[PDB]
Amino acid sequence: DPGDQICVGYHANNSTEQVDTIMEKNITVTHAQDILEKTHNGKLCNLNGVKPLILKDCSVAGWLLGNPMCDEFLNVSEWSYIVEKASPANGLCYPGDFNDYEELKHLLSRINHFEKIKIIPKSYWSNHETSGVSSACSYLENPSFFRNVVWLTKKDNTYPPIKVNYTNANQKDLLVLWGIHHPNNEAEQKMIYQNLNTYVSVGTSTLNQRLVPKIATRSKVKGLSGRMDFFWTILKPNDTINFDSNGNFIAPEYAYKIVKKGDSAIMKSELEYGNCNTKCQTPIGAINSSMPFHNIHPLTIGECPKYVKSNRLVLATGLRNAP
Amino acid sequence: DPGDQICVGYHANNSTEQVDTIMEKNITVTHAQDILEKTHNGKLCNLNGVKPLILKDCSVAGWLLGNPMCDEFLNVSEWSYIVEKASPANGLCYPGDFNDYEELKHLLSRINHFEKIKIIPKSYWSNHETSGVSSACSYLENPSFFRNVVWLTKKDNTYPPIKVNYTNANQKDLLVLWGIHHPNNEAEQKMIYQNLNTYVSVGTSTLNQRLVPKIATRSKVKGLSGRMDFFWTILKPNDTINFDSNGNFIAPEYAYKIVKKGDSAIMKSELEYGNCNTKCQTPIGAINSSMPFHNIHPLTIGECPKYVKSNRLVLATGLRNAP
Amino acid sequence: DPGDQICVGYHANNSTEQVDTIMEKNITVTHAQDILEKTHNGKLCNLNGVKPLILKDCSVAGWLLGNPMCDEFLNVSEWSYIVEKASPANGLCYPGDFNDYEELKHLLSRINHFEKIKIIPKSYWSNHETSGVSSACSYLENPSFFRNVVWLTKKDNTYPPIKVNYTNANQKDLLVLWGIHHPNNEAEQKMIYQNLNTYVSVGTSTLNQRLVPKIATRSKVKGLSGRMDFFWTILKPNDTINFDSNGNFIAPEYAYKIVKKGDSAIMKSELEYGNCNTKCQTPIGAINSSMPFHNIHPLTIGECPKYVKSNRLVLATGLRNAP
Amino acid sequence: GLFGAIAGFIEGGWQGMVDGWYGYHHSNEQGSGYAADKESTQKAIDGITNKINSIIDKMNTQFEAVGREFNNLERRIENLNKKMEDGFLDVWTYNAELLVLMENERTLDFHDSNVKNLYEKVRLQLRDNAKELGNGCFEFYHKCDNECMESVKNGTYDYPQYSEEARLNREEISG
Amino acid sequence: GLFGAIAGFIEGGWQGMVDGWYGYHHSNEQGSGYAADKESTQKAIDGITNKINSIIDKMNTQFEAVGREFNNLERRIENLNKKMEDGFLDVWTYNAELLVLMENERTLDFHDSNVKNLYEKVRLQLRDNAKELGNGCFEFYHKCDNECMESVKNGTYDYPQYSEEARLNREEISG
Amino acid sequence: GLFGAIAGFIEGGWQGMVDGWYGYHHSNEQGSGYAADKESTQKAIDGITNKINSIIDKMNTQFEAVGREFNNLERRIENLNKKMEDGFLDVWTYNAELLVLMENERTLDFHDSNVKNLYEKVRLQLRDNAKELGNGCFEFYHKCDNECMESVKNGTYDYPQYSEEARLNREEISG
């Protein structure tokens, strides 16, 4: 005859959750914890207290040199990170090359605080014209130039030798930019600079540069065949930058004071501002998440989950849930 | 008294196969699957439909410029991958330097289809001799030159200033090559070029180059002390390359049209052609295999197993096979 | 009534040793093997039979060129590894740039045996003064120069054109060093070199260099505004180096014969010599250990444990030790 | 099942038990009910919970990619940079997918072990004072009231106190 | 052995069984023979097979090396390039050798578990209607014909149908 | 415990046993004493020892960092170099910490398995010639002298030689 019983058994519920195993997939389980974050707001947000520099259709070169199509940015001074398009349209309006550009962009990705200062006022050029201007560097269909650098030309019919210095009074590093113009022929050279064999020399404690115009025939870019090559350096505190020139000099009017260095980044993205906040940003959107992982995009900034290429990461917690 | 029995037991066979464990090695097992591929045909085979460029004793420079010891290659146009020896013997027959060579070799490893075209015919040089030739660039013991570039020299006793352009009519990128000659002394300079202070300038929309001969005393290489430095650029579609020179110009006769870019490679190998086909090639031979791994050589091309340095990878499938 | 018993049980002891598990930490265990090495002698020791080059307050440049503040090192010839401070103070006493310095430091980290040889004796300069000297390159507060290179200046009031060669008789590679001086103005140029438009040209079988002084205004460094730029090359066996100059030449007196190449290193450390031996050295001390791992510093030299960032790595061997 | 309990001899699991992961279902003259062993269930929560956190912590340091720009003649180092950064992404993706796959297996078999260990904790308590049915149930040879059972559950089960009664009913089914 | 079955209490394995991995050897009055449990053998094939494919799939993305040229004054980045490419080769070689070593262990103990689980599937069916000899064999207290046994194999074994007969022969060896 | 033996049914371990990892404690009319099973203990030493060496050998090739200098305008490749070298340090640190954490678990459960396997080696030898108490002890139904026990330890235990004596004392506690 039947007696009292005790049994041993285990938990079950109405749970659809599956996890994976090396030996078996799609195991219906009791409880499971998903550890992969697979959603983003799709927006370029502020990073903590601070807003990004969104360059829109300008490039770093366009912004720093002052392409007239980029006047929006003449007075930025503090950001969290920089956003720049894949192929911005407004960089060097006057066709040329920017020397050590990537090294400068990299240097820039360690900086979050500029203060643009006036290093050599146009008032200085008492024996040179400062009105150098081009149709490629044109604003409202009316020939203009880079806002931060000045195209010196002959005054009357002379170009007296230039010798100007600037000392870094401040206690911050200083980013100075200059340039040289490469004319098309000896004629054009004489028309702008009078002098026929020219140089631009820049000297600091570390720099020792001698530039010389290169007259050659080139294809037309923005209708021009001339060229303009730009260069940069970091002027340390209590050091002096020394320009000497007898022509073709594109002089610095503004320099940038480096007030705060921080961890930053230049992101390639086609998105606009998002007017929103985050603790973790990617080029395709921001992340609000506690997950230990995410799979949205490798290039992140801020305190983020770890990126993996997985489309699914879920840990079993409970036990096999029998039907 | 004895009764009916049932037993539980497990499979065994006459199997020698061993597998390994963290805690015990050389475990004799029942069944095992080897997953490492350890054999290759030892041959440089075609890759799918397509045959490799085997440069033999020429180098990429030797081939592209047309070292006379490399005429075999004057009309290659389609390959799967390139094979070049460790130390080819026929590169720059006239001693010199090839500017940004590795960047060009790299660029070349993304190309599988050339079409060599005639960009500036010798007929053009109506006021210059095109017969420049050397004993270092010698063919059948009789002084010759690079097949694809032309050594311009003075005609009669003048060297009129050169100004020639070429526009990229086509819809493919174009690889143009040129050079400059560095003579030994002012005398030799005058004997070849008449003119005493010379330049070569090349201009595109992106390029802005000015080259100037360097007269100096150098050690003898192939009996010569003179030198010849070569340079390249990619001429995009609908853009014009512009040469200006008054001496020392090594002019392009042929340019290379870049018809197809594909995933490719330049392999270092001492082997010849193999006259065979494969889906996976290495520098020491090809692979016909389904194994998930191989250990033959890291540098592979095509759909291949994953390379590991292991000499043995075998999975246990069956159970411990008791003696 | 009670009968004979047998029991099954397991080992226990008075053991405090703990190990860790994914599912539980601080498991008190019976036996355990620590596999992480966490102590170093804190000393820069010899490496096997051989002692390091400890440059103290000199830099590689300072040593090789012969900064007078570094005479200690004028005759080193054999080391195991090199130690150099983060910011040595005695490098280029005369302000300038060392061309391809990091590539030379790297080349040096493959060398453990120099033999300094006299390549061009001062006796050679029969028509030039060799007494060029500066207050920046000053020894006992009395203006001196680099010990291994010679500052040629005008003798009487002329500087005859220089043309000197050296052939590598030996069967070892040879490291030759030279330089050029960049004066402040045309006046100073004439005072030192007489000649007004100058060049230094160096030629080997591979090298083809033309250097030209750069007169420009620069900030003061060690009270000087002039500069001196140095350059190096490897002269292979049975090849000749060829200098031509008409001024500003800083000539090689000594070259370095490369007798033995070995695996070596340049370590950044602030420590002095240790007068001790080891088989494994790090920048912060040496290791005497059998452990398969260590966590002291990533940059090691010699037969060493594998570096990990772990502060603890211990394997359980025995079983859970119940209280 | 690796240990034979879950979907093994204990075929199927109890929708009825809810307060825990592993537990008992009694059935006596006073009545029935499910009760979960909180000793073994809590030890399985402290286990899995620690596991998760440890998987997360081992991953808290791992390779973070950063944008770097190269020009038209730095293709080689650009490509080096690209392969390097994919290399680590592929490496850490492998480590995470594999660690999860592996610890998942170890998790399920852990539950399996925990159940069979709990069944054995009972079997070894009762011995011949009860019968094992082969389904994870014990039929008592004696009388277990809603107070005797709490002893076997708490482990505090006095064997000789029922031994004699039990013996006589077990031998009854014979002579 | 981790589970105690293979080269444990079931000492030695059967050269005779062939149609499967785990199975039975019967011995009654009608005769003998080996028969493999296809339920448990097929579940072990679906297991190992899935394992292999998963090891392969986790490896289907991993670092591929590419040739890159450097000149005489790019020794630093050449060496960087070299260390980087060895780094991944050493990394993936470690991952493959270790994954194999680990899953090998898990494979053998799986077979071990599968056998002990199969032995237990029988033991719990028979209970006291048979005797366990300690070698992986059960001696029946009743009569098992070549049709009764197929019931214990298929799991469809009617316990009470033999219970009574069995009881009388088990108690026979006593009084 | 994963296998249920160590800190399971065999609650607590013996400070008294010393010559080995797993073993027996006998108690008969001639006297007591601990003795360690050297068969199973030596197999556990050969196991763990091989494990250590294999962990070391798999690690004998792995990424070694080297110092490289960059100038003020090689920040990009300097940073590339830095991330690359941290990448491998973080990778190998993960592999070592995880391999240890994992094999530690496998080690403890191995000891656990080894003990339960040893207990079962005895249980299956004795069968009904003794009683299992549920604490890892067997009470003999017959007489085991300091020479009979060495048979069960060595595995050389003649069951029928004691079977008859044993049967009569087991049935005694009944009628």
Ligand SMILES: CC(=O)N[C@@H]1[C@@H](O[C@@H]2O[C@H](CO)[C@H](O)[C@H](O[C@]3(C(=O)O)C[C@H](O)[C@@H](NC(C)=O)[C@H]([C@H](O)[C@H](O)CO)O3)[C@H]2O)[C@H](O)[C@@H](CO)O[C@H]1O
């Ligand atoms: C190569 C040539 O001769 N082209 C002729 C055209 O000349 C150029 O054409 C562009 C428009 O396509 C401009 O008019 C150029 O004029 C400027 C400019 O760039 O806008 C006018 C500037 O004020 C002048 N600035 C300074 C500071 O000198 C600038 C510079 O001289 C040059 O940029 C220096 O290289 O040039 C003009 O140069 C011409 O417009 C056309 C019809 O007249 O005929 C073309 O053959």
Ligand SMILES: CC(=O)N[C@@H]1[C@@H](O[C@@H]2O[C@H](CO)[C@H](O)[C@H](O[C@]3(C(=O)O)C[C@H](O)[C@@H](NC(C)=O)[C@H]([C@H](O)[C@H](O)CO)O3)[C@H]2O)[C@H](O)[C@@H](CO)O[C@H]1O
């Ligand atoms: C340095 C010097 O004067 N050496 C003398 C030898 O002159 C050189 O020797 C080589 C053989 O070793 C050749 O004969 C050279 O002649 C050529 C050449 O390279 O083959 C002849 C070419 O036709 C000529 N081509 C052109 C287009 O000018 C070529 C060039 O001039 C040079 O390559 C430019 O650098 O030179 C010859 O230059 C000389 O052979 C030997 C005995 O006469 O005496 C040596 O001292």
Ligand SMILES: CC(=O)N[C@@H]1[C@@H](O[C@@H]2O[C@H](CO)[C@H](O)[C@H](O[C@]3(C(=O)O)C[C@H](O)[C@@H](NC(C)=O)[C@H]([C@H](O)[C@H](O)CO)O3)[C@H]2O)[C@H](O)[C@@H](CO)O[C@H]1O
């Ligand atoms: C820029 C200028 O004119 N400065 C004046 C000072 O001249 C320089 O000052 C330094 C000390 O700060 C030295 O006296 C320099 O003199 C030397 C030197 O470097 O020591 C003297 C060397 O014998 C001489 N050597 C050679 C081989 O020529 C060396 C070189 O000429 C230069 O280094 C080349 O650039 O110069 C001196 O040049 C001057 O001391 C001070 C007061 O007289 O006034 C300053 O305006």
Ligand SMILES: *[C@@H]1O[C@H](CO)[C@@H](O)[C@H](O)[C@H]1NC(C)=O
């Ligand atoms: C596992 O489940 C997913 C989601 O339902 C499904 O897409 C996939 O095909 C399943 N895998 C297998 C092997 O059936």
Ligand SMILES: *[C@@H]1O[C@H](CO)[C@@H](O)[C@H](O)[C@H]1NC(C)=O
């Ligand atoms: C800057 O230039 C002025 C004259 O233009 C000169 O007197 C002064 O010394 C220079 N400053 C420095 C630091 O060289």
Ligand SMILES: *[C@@H]1O[C@H](CO)[C@@H](O)[C@H](O)[C@H]1NC(C)=O
């Ligand atoms: C394992 O087997 C191989 C091949 O027979 C042999 O070379 C090796 O020595 C064996 N390993 C050991 C530890 O005996």
Ligand SMILES: *[C@@H]1O[C@H](CO)[C@@H](O)[C@H](O)[C@H]1NC(C)=O
């Ligand atoms: C090419 O050169 C010819 C004359 O040599 C010139 O007329 C023509 O404009 C040039 N083409 C271009 C695109 O500059």
Ligand SMILES: *[C@@H]1O[C@H](CO)[C@@H](O)[C@H](O)[C@H]1NC(C)=O
């Ligand atoms: C493990 O032990 C260490 C050393 O005693 C201690 O610092 C740590 O807090 C312990 N961990 C936990 C989780 O208690």
Ligand SMILES: *[C@@H]1O[C@H](CO)[C@@H](O)[C@H](O)[C@H]1NC(C)=O
């Ligand atoms: C070295 O120079 C001497 C004259 O200064 C010259 O005669 C000799 O040929 C040169 N050596 C070489 C190898 O050029």
